[PDB]
């Protein structure tokens, strides 16, 4: 996307909130709206627990996602300016 290495975006709606399998990627997906271009895309969170922390209308940093749904290119890295992985290890709290 663009020329940047990261993007800030807005959580629309954790589509796949009605999921049956826990670790499925359509559970872990979320539609975001990248701000600068105002564009809707979807991204993955690495873990369902972190999906529980993320809520709507929080600013989301995300980046590339490179290595059952191949094609989602982005992965969320920071929400409201805090590291998702540090929340996930329970290092910091999330500013609301």
């Amino acid at each position: 996307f663009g020329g940047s290495s990261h993007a800030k975006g807005i959580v629309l709606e954790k589509v796949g909130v009605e999921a049956k399998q826990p670790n499925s990627a359509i559970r872990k997906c979320v539609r975001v709206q990248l701000i600068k271009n105002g564009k809707k895309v979807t991204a993955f969170v690495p873990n369902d627990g972190c999906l529980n922390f993320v809520d709507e209308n929080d600013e989301v940093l995300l980046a590339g996602f490179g290595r059952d749904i191949p094609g989602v290119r982005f992965k969320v890295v920071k929400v409201s300016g805090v590291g998702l992985l540090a929340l996930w290890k329970e290092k910091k709290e999330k500013p609301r």
């Binding site: 663009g2 020329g3 940047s4 290495s5 990261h6």
Partner: peptide, 10 residues
Amino acid sequence: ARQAARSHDI
């Protein structure tokens, strides 16, 4: 180019 990418980061 690095200045352009840096500015986009800004």
